[PDB]
Write a protein that binds this ligand. Sequence first.
Ligand SMILES: [Mg+2]
Ligand SMILES: [Mg+2]
Ligand SMILES: [Mg+2]
Ligand SMILES: [Mg+2]
Ligand SMILES: [Mg+2]
Ligand SMILES: [Mg+2]
Ligand SMILES: [Mg+2]
Ligand SMILES: [Mg+2]
Ligand SMILES: [Mg+2]
Ligand SMILES: [Mg+2]
Ligand SMILES: [Mg+2]
Ligand SMILES: [Mg+2]
Ligand SMILES: [Mg+2]
Ligand SMILES: [Mg+2]
Ligand SMILES: [Mg+2]
Ligand SMILES: [Mg+2]
Ligand SMILES: [Mg+2]
Ligand SMILES: [Mg+2]
Ligand SMILES: [Mg+2]
Ligand SMILES: [Mg+2]
Ligand SMILES: [Mg+2]
Ligand SMILES: [Mg+2]
Ligand SMILES: [Mg+2]
Ligand SMILES: [Mg+2]
Ligand SMILES: [Mg+2]
Ligand SMILES: [Mg+2]
Ligand SMILES: [Mg+2]
Ligand SMILES: [Mg+2]
Ligand SMILES: [Mg+2]
Ligand SMILES: [Mg+2]
Ligand SMILES: [Mg+2]
Ligand SMILES: [Mg+2]
Ligand SMILES: [Mg+2]
Ligand SMILES: [Mg+2]
Ligand SMILES: [Mg+2]
Ligand SMILES: [Mg+2]
Ligand SMILES: [Mg+2]
Ligand SMILES: [Mg+2]
Ligand SMILES: [Mg+2]
Ligand SMILES: [Mg+2]
Lengths: 54, 119, 44, 117, 109
Amino acid sequence: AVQQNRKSRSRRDMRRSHDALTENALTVDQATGETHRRHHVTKDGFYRGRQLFA
Amino acid sequence: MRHRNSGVKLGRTSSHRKAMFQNLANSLFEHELIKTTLPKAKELRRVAEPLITLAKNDTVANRRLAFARTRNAATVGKLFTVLGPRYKERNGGYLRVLKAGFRAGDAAPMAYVELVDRE
Amino acid sequence: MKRTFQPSELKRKRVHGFRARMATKAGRQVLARRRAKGRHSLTV
Amino acid sequence: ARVKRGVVAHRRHKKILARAKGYYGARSRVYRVAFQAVIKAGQYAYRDRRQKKRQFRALWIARINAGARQNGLSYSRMIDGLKKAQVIIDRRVLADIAMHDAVAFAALAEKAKGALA
Amino acid sequence: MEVTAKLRGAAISAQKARLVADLIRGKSVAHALNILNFSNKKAAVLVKKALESAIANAEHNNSLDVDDLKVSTIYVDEGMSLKRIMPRAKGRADRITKRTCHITVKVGV
RNA sequence: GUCAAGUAAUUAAGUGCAUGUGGUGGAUGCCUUGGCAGUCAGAGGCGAUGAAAGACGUGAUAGCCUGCGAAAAGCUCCGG
RNA sequence: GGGGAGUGAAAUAGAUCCUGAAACCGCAUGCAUACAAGCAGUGGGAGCACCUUUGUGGUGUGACUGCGUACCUUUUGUAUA
RNA sequence: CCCACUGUCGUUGAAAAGCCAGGGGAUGACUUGUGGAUAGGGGUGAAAGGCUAAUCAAGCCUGGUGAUAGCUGGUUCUCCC
RNA sequence: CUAAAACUAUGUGCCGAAGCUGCGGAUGUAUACUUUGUAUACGUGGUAGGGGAGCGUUCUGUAAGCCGAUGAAGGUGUGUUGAGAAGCAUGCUGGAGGUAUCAGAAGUGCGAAUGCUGACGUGAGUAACGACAAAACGGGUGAAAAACCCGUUCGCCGAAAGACCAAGGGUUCCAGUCCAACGUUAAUCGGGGCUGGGUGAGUCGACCCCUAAGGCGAGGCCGAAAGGCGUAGUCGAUGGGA
Ligand SMILES: [Mg+2]
Ligand SMILES: [Mg+2]
Ligand SMILES: [Mg+2]
Ligand SMILES: [Mg+2]
Ligand SMILES: [Mg+2]
Ligand SMILES: [Mg+2]
Ligand SMILES: [Mg+2]
Ligand SMILES: [Mg+2]
Ligand SMILES: [Mg+2]
Ligand SMILES: [Mg+2]
Ligand SMILES: [Mg+2]
Ligand SMILES: [Mg+2]
Ligand SMILES: [Mg+2]
Ligand SMILES: [Mg+2]
Ligand SMILES: [Mg+2]
Ligand SMILES: [Mg+2]
Ligand SMILES: [Mg+2]
Ligand SMILES: [Mg+2]
Ligand SMILES: [Mg+2]
Ligand SMILES: [Mg+2]
Ligand SMILES: [Mg+2]
Ligand SMILES: [Mg+2]
Ligand SMILES: [Mg+2]
Ligand SMILES: [Mg+2]
Ligand SMILES: [Mg+2]
Ligand SMILES: [Mg+2]
Ligand SMILES: [Mg+2]
Ligand SMILES: [Mg+2]
Ligand SMILES: [Mg+2]
Ligand SMILES: [Mg+2]
Ligand SMILES: [Mg+2]
Ligand SMILES: [Mg+2]
Ligand SMILES: [Mg+2]
Ligand SMILES: [Mg+2]
Ligand SMILES: [Mg+2]
Ligand SMILES: [Mg+2]
Ligand SMILES: [Mg+2]
Ligand SMILES: [Mg+2]
Ligand SMILES: [Mg+2]
Ligand SMILES: [Mg+2]
């Protein structure tokens, strides 16, 4: 139910050794030069040479 | 296990789920472009495309079926006068789903659902 | 649950009020003690 | 005369924690643990001042044994023969000679051999 | 020559901001701004505020071009905590800490 | 050159120690506006002419404090 | 919130403001560490790095290795589970 | 409406005694509002030592009071005999 | 491990302790002897406990002295000295005090008391986010919108989850404005902050007249005192009176 000894700072860091984040997959769109998330629409509404909300 | 099972849950009862997809389909047929969560958008295909397939042929029985599945008279009118005639020689694929980042308050992945030859 | 306080202002003033304290020797000793301590409120 | 025990107590704790540099974890940071660690290091060092002499003598004896067995002897008979030949070189010097100068050690083994005969 | 920006008193614990700080340490500022733009982390917003502040400082106060600036140093320290009470079952009470942090960013050529 | 046998260097997800540089925190030092104990000398009461203690008010503009009381941060006279 | 500019003798004296310790939490550098069993040290000891020097020098680290079951209290007696 | 028989759940609870499903009484020796009375070796008790402000084989507060404790615990720098 | 690495007997060597010896150093007692320094000898494991000698801290005198902005105390390193408690010097920080010596007085030394106060860890970025009546989309605003507003749908209650009083609360009511903190998330929203506004009575209620239970009670009776009971009266709504 609870620890019998306080965990040392070294073991705590060794547990967090798997906590790192990853970057996302970003691509530069060619029809706008923009950078967007891959397979995602841009915030301007562009995706693969197609426009939403002109 | 879940082997070969189809369908979603989305944390709702089946009554709530049926109602929510009815609402979503009505909204999409009215605006032709909506923003929703990505799993909702992917399940909305199996709900909204058979309605268009139904609206391809205009019979009183078909319009009554469309009303039983939408319960929205304006949606039925639009299906059988605009959307049905539009997708007459298109063999499926009336919706287009495009991933659209994440919601702010939620970090839930989002998607746009639009009709194919809209606007 | 029903808790013990159950307020009523008339009953408060009739049990712990100024005139109730002034009406007996022990209550006036209460008032003298609370003046000696420098309390800002003498009574309820 | 109220005495505040802040400067002197801090000085003492700092001394104990300076004698604990290099120890692991709390043993170098936390005074209660560092103080025991330091007292124990002291007891260990006292005991090991004695143990070091035994350890180095055993090393010299092993090296002399190797050198004497390269010369057809053993440590026992070589030490006995060198003591019968009035040679009084001690084991530290004998082990140094065996490790660094094989010809002089063969000469010493010859003295021991001739005395054993 | 490093140019510094300090975001002091950001309402987030250091443990969570450090995950984002580790992501962009030693990177170009264009790459770091890209990484921070497309993250769903709350710390990404605050680290982006601090990093774009450092870039603006480098350009205005130090006359450094942005195309070769680099995130040469970044670290998150703890700040002043807020202490609050949380009622628990059976009349027990717990102490809640609302942890803040200080972000330091240094950009260099 | 190839093959075989033998045998080095080379990683750090993270961690330890040391140093450097920070954060947090508010110890220490220095300081005193407040206290403690006395000595000497006084005084030892206030109140129906309404006390102690209060409430409410009172300001060009005031929240609280202090003063004051519908004559209300005050009126008159005398002295400095 | 900060960076400059300015004030000031001083701004890591900038209002959470004299000094600014420890616990505790970062980042940077050097060395070690992913075939190896335990109070984490101690005695020895290679290698590496940096200072210096022509050192049998200093500073950090510490492969490998012998020995080694915390402190207090209470007890006939405690590594004591 | 008053109560609380059974069970599950809850047991750092939504809750320092509940919820939910069932259960009992429900024109009476009923339930309930407002106001009043009884005060600590006392009160009140269709009586369980029950209740008397989440406290009851003698309430709480203050004072005697720094009660007493042949019992636990603790007792702070150095060296020498 | 088997003509032993077993057993019996015998021998020659060797290893082996903080024992003994060597070398160097300190110290107690005693004896000589300068007359307090060296020799000589014997000694120097220790709990309870007894004895002896010291270190350091605050304060008083010495001190109207001595050191200090050419940098005190304090803090943080380094080097060094002593058997120890400790001392000394010095780099950085710091910005105004410090104090020899010899006496004197003690709130004079902390690791433990399930010690006390404050700070900060571990658990751990874990459990949980408070009724399983339910949401969806479009537009607006905004730095930012799952939650705010407008709209279109969906759902839930409907002997309460609606409406009105008493009690209690005390401005939470309404409008403009702001988002740090508070709101178990965000918030542009709010019962949050700031500014302003708002409660209109002969008939409603209270006050008022009247009394119940009960209280207080001139006199009075009783009681060491304090006080207790009570007559006349006077209060007291939960009831009566336009
Ligand atoms: Mg680390
Ligand atoms: Mg399938
Ligand atoms: Mg869910
Ligand atoms: Mg149903
Ligand atoms: Mg790493
Ligand atoms: Mg202080
Ligand atoms: Mg400074
Ligand atoms: Mg400061
Ligand atoms: Mg290895
Ligand atoms: Mg026992
Ligand atoms: Mg026993
Ligand atoms: Mg033992
Ligand atoms: Mg134990
Ligand atoms: Mg154990
Ligand atoms: Mg029930
Ligand atoms: Mg019945
Ligand atoms: Mg009693
Ligand atoms: Mg009686
Ligand atoms: Mg009984
Ligand atoms: Mg009793
Ligand atoms: Mg006591
Ligand atoms: Mg020996
Ligand atoms: Mg001996
Ligand atoms: Mg000697
Ligand atoms: Mg001895
Ligand atoms: Mg002894
Ligand atoms: Mg003391
Ligand atoms: Mg303690
Ligand atoms: Mg989470
Ligand atoms: Mg866990
Ligand atoms: Mg889990
Ligand atoms: Mg969970
Ligand atoms: Mg909720
Ligand atoms: Mg409102
Ligand atoms: Mg918030
Ligand atoms: Mg408000
Ligand atoms: Mg009476
Ligand atoms: Mg009378
Ligand atoms: Mg009356
Ligand atoms: Mg009435």
